Amino acid sequence: LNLAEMEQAWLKRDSRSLEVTRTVSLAAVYRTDNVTLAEGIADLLKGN
Amino acid sequence: NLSIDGQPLSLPVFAAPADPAALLSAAAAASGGSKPLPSADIPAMRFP
């Protein structure tokens, strides 16, 4: 009975849903840091 | 109306006893209304 209560709650709360992709070019959010990946990756050369 | 010995010369008062009553108890049909259907909603899944 509890499982059926939960299943029917699910069947009422279930529906379609909007779904989106977001392409996050991390070079941009690195440009927000002005330390962008292109030169933030090559300079990293150490066995630290 | 007795005899010389005081014994009654008449026939005694007989009394037909009562027939034991037939027991009778209450018997009633169970009564109850139906239940109304719940509110409807279009689910997430198709009909099949």
Protein chain pair with the most extensive contact, residues per chain: A-B, 5 and 4 residues
Beta-strand portion of chain A reads under 5%
Q: Largest beta sheet of chain A, briefly?
A: none
Could you tell me how far the N terminus lies from the C terminus of chain A, measured between alpha carbons in angstroms? 60 Å
Structural class of chain A: mainly alpha
Shape of chain A: elongated
Q: From the alpha carbons, calculate the radius of gyration of chain A and give it in angstroms.
A: 23 Å
| Total helical elements of chain A | 3
Series of secondary-structure elements of chain A, N-terminal to C-terminal: HHH
Assembly state: part of a larger assembly
State the total count of DSSP E strands of chain A. Answer: 0
Helicity range of chain A: 40-55%
PDB class: toxin
Keywords: toxin, complex, glycan
Entry title: Morganella morganii TcdA4 in complex with porcine mucosa heparin
Chains A, B: Insecticidal toxin protein
Question: What does the secondary structure layout of this molecule look like, with pairings?
Answer:
The structure is cut from a larger assembly and holds two copies of chain A (48 residues).
Chain A: H1 2-13, H2 26-31, H3 37-42
